[PDB]
Amino acid sequence: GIKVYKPTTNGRRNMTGSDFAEITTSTPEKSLLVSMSKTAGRNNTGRITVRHHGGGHKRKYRMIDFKRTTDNVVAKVATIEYDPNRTANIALIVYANGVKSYILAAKGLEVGMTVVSGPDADIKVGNALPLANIPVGTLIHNIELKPGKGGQLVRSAGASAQVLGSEGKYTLVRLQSGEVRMILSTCRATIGVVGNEQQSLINLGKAGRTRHMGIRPTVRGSVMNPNDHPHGGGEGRQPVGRKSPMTPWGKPALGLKTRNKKAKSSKLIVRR
Amino acid sequence: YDIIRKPIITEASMAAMDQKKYTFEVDSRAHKLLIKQAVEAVFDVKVASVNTISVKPKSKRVGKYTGTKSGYKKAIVTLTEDSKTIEI
Amino acid sequence: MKRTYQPHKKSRKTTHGFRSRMATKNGRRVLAARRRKGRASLTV
RNA sequence: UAUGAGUAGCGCAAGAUAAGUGAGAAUCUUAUCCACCGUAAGACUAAGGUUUCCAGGGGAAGGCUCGUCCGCCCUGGGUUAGUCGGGACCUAAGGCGAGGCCGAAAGGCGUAGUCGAUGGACAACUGGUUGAUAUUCCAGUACUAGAUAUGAUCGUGAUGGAGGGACGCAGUAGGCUAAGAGAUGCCAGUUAAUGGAUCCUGGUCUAAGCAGUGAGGUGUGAGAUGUGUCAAAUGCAUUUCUCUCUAACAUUGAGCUGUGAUGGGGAAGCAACUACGGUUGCGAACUCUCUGAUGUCACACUGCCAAGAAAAGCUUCUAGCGUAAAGUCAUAUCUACCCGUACCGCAAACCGACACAGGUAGUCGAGGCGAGUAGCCUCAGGUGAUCGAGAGAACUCUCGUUAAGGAACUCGGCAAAAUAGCCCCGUAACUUCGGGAGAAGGGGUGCUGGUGUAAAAGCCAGCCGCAGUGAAUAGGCCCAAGCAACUGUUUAUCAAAAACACAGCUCUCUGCUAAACCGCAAGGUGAUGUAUAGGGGGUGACGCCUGCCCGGUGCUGGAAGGU
RNA sequence: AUGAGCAGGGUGAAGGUGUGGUAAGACGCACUGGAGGCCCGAACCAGGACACGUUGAAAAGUGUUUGGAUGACUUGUGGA
């Protein structure tokens, strides 16, 4: 879903348009209170601590149902709203008790589908079953190794997820890129699909509109000083033959993997 | 109790006399309601209120070093009528 | 052009007030140097 | 203490005479003209300055000269609040942080909590008033909150529960109004030199209340299951429907209409006396037309994506409520704290060592032309900014000209020149199809009467002109190539670019208490992020294309053996 | 983080609408309509060039041109 801008002026040359085109109207709900926060990368210490960054707005976040540990209710979707934050969109929900709960939206849902889990429900889009209930070869997200603990894992803005299999205590699941974790089988799960898909291909001309995105620009390492970077500056834009260029910090970057195989993990793996 | 400092005699003091007002001084650690009722006690004069103002200290030179003359809270005694003015 | 100090009252304090200087166990030490010398004043 | 040297400079703008003043006047004061600024060089207001203000007196230094003058000096006064700004309210960003966490120590972190305005909460506004204070002093009107005095009656209804406050940007339309123009109307002068009358002030009302309205949004409600509102709730949103969506109704609302409020304001002037300077007193109409805002409704609406503070004051619900005058309204009269309040503030008080040629919030900001807050001359207002006189040397620098010729000068049309306004014609090249492009080039442009221009140009004829955006103010163009796409950013105290950056494109790393990073750790970022995300490396749109070589290096992976 | 702004005037997209257009869309021309690192040009913010001065008004300027001029703007406030 991508319109264009007409190439009127320079800078407005390509300007791959939005096609929001789908989202319910405007005005997100006011008791969706999450306080705004900008570390701007810099820490408790606060020098920079974290690279090129900054320049968005007072991004008034809002509580999505990260966990959805609720039960078998008319969990009515009402609206699918815009997200400033994350790539997929979002949706309001009222239960029987008259609450304002709120979920990540999907591809093809609609207001009044009221989709819910006990894990009573079947395989239709929007159920928080565990994979102990979900059969083989399905398209899920929101599976996190800690039961009673919502999205930290591959509930994914972007595309959703898939599941190959399961055995015993765990679940043989791909994420992307030929990767499988085996997750605790009675941990919750939301069958379905991501909200937005094409929000990987929008090209936007102005450096300043990427500043409206909110990252101050990224320097190359090249013309930087020997004081600055292992790209040893000198005559011209000279090449770098200095054995696989790297961070301004002190480790090589290309190639090597840095697994930390000595983890609370690695018995939950794929070949890669 | 009588912690009124002194009166103040300007050319506006006679305008205060015609206005049934005064220009009296007290210590800094004060309140216009408190010196109001103190004035009511030792004077039996019927006060409307007092204005606010104090004076900064005047640090000029007085002598061969700097005359660090101090400020004082110029109390504008706003009376009502039908009471005892004091002509001192 | 523009010069360094065009301070306001918050500006002239909030680095050098008696609790600011007193605070960090350190500026009060150099204030105590300023006392053991005992110059024209202390806090500014 | 010389010296240079009585030389540089005398710190960006024009005063002038007469009279006073004194002892001594250029430079002090007045009068009278001139002059300048005037989207300011006005007024008012932040920070700041910290009394510089004013009155009187004086002139040791200071004033870049003089100096009776002064931001200089002595002396004396000068700043007034229930409502103005803050605090006695709340809270962001942040800071401190008992608890706790870790750490040789000091420490550094941090839950509760605590302060922290530039924010959000809320009553007063007109007139007069000094040498100076005015929303502060007082006349008139309030309102806010409390008090004690006084017919309630069970009522209050919380830290809970809601609601609400409560918010992005752009742009258009009105609505009204400040504000301005024109005449009605009022007051005073028919001016003196051809002419011979028209001349300029005129031109009020404050908010609060009382009652409505420009109008706006807004859908409403009712019933039942409540399923909940960590307890409860009649308050709330939704289960389900009767509807019924007239929008009645809930809900806000510029201005105006009267009232408020007949309030003294108001000039030529008039008298009086106070020097007759001045003060006191007295005294005019108070109309309408037209423009009318970016102010106003009001982020009201429309529209578009970078999707847009906070709590608290406030309402509602009940847990409670001696609920018995807690409550509660009438009633009555008082009260309403503390700090700040003067002046200057585009500036001789600020910050530039200085009476400096910088910098310095914000809000208003006249007419006439004029789109215009640009010009240009005069409003209101304010100012003459600090050494002058001579003489017009040469020279130095800012300005105006120039035959004839043109860039022949020079490394280089470098600087200056010249063009530009508005309208109306017209407009190549390639193009990523928008542009180019104001391409270029062309024409017009004053006034008089018509007629048509008022909504409205063009007509006609004439009058003229050296000249018709009469001056001011306001593009030199073209061809071609290289580099860079572009806008941005770039060494303030040299260098703005081909340098950086940038979307883009490429690769690689990271499945999460991420990787990476910061810190001894703790803690935290990364991000309430989840591989379309995060980190690193390259290159820098779009179009085409990215060929070969794993010997070596590094990387990755593997394990037989050596080590 | 909270705020303040940033005169005017063109330009004209997208969007929307309606009819000729269409089986029906694509099309036609209106109408809105302004989005826009749009343009000119004020304040404002810079400093490209040039002259002046350079023991300078000045520890970094003046003066004349020049750019941006609704943004990656400018900048108050108060912080790290």
Nucleotide nearest to C11 (CA to C1'): E78
Alpha-helix residue ranges (DSSP H) falling in chain B: 13-18, 32-43
Q: What is the CA radius of gyration of chain A?
A: 23
Q: What is the CA radius of gyration of chain C?
A: 13
- Separation between Cα atoms, residue A213 and residue A230, nearest integer Å: 30
Does strand E come within 7 Å of the CB of A54?
A: no
Q: From residues 113-152 of A, which are strand E contacts by CB within 7 A?
A: none
* Contacting residues 55-74/A vs strand E (CB within 7 A): 55, 58
CA of C17 to C1' of D145 (A): 38
Q: Is the CB of A209 under 7 A from strand E?
A: yes
Which chains contact C through at least 3 pairs of Cβ atoms less than 8 Å apart? none
Protein-proximal nucleotides of chain E (any atom < 7 Å from a CB):
1-2, 12-14, 35-38, 60-61, 71-72, 77-80
Determine the 3-state secondary structure of A172 from DSSP.
strand
- Nearest nucleotide to A208 (CA to C1') is E72
Residue A270 token pair = 């794929």
* Tokens 């319109």 belong to residue: A3
Query: Is B22:B7 a contact under the CB 8 Å cutoff?
Result: yes
Question: Could you check: is the Cβ of residue A262 within 7 Å of any atom of nucleic acid strand E?
Answer: no
Closest nucleotide C1' to the C-alpha of C7: D48
The amino acid that residue A121 corresponds to is A
CA A39 to chain centre: 19
> What's the token pair of residue A228?
């600055």
Q: Which nucleotide is nearest to A7 (CA to C1')?
A: D434
> CA–C1' distance B20–E69 (Å)?
63
Residues 10-29, chain A, CB closer than 7 Å to nucleic strand E: 11-12
Chain B touching partners, 3 or more CB pairs below 8 A: none
Structure tokens at A38: 């900008």
Q: How far apart are the first and last CA of chain B?
A: 20
Question: What b/e string do you get for B51-69 counting C-beta neighbours within 10 Å, with b at 16 or more?
Answer: eeeeeeeeeeeeeeeeeee
What's the CA–C1' distance between A223 and E70, in Å?
34
| Contact assessment for residue A180 and residue A172, using Cβ atoms and an 8 Å cutoff | yes
Q: Which long-range contacts does A162-166 make (Cβ < 8 Å, 24+ apart)?
A: A162/A138, A163/A131, A163/A134, A163/A136, A163/A137, A163/A138, A163/A139, A164/A136, A164/A137, A165/A136, A165/A137, A166/A131, A166/A132, A166/A136
> Exposed, middle or buried by CB within 10 Å (0-12, 13-18, 19+), for C28?
middle
Residue A139, class by beta-carbon neighbours within 10 Å (0-12 exposed, 13-18 middle, 19+ buried)? middle
How far apart are the C-alpha atoms of B67 and B21, rounded to whole Å? Answer: 32
Q: How far is the CA of A207 from the C1' of D153 (A)?
A: 72
- Strand D: list positions under 7 Å from protein Cβ: 47-52, 74-75, 77-82, 93, 96, 106-110, 131-132, 136-138, 162-166, 168, 226-229, 236-239, 304-311, 335-341, 350-352, 358-359, 432-434, 485-488, 492, 499-505, 507-519, 522-526, 528-533, 535-542, 553-557
Neighbours of B2 (CB within 10 A): 8
Q: How many angstroms separate the CA atoms of A125 and A109, rounded?
A: 7
How many other C-beta atoms are found inside a 10 Å radius of the C-beta of residue A152? 10
Pairing of strands A165-167, B21-26: unpaired
Give the tokens for residue A176. 């992307």
Tell which residue, A36, A41, A192, has the closest CA to residue A116. Answer: A192
Separation in Å: E72 C1' and A11 CA: 13
**D17 C1' – B85 CA distance, angstroms?**
59
Output the distance from A62 CA to D121 C1' rounded to whole Å: 26
Method of determination used here:
cryo-EM
Nucleotide nearest to A40 (CA to C1'): D525
Q: Which nucleotide is nearest to A46 (CA to C1')?
A: E80
Nucleotide nearest to B28 (CA to C1'): D338
- Spell out the long-range contacts of A147-155 with Cβ–Cβ below 8 A and sequence spacing 24 or more: A147/A184, A147/A186, A147/A187, A147/A188, A148/A67, A148/A69, A149/A67, A150/A65, A150/A66, A150/A67, A150/A68, A150/A69, A150/A188, A151/A66, A151/A67, A153/A183, A155/A104, A155/A190
Q: Are A107 and A193 in contact (CB under 8 A)?
A: yes
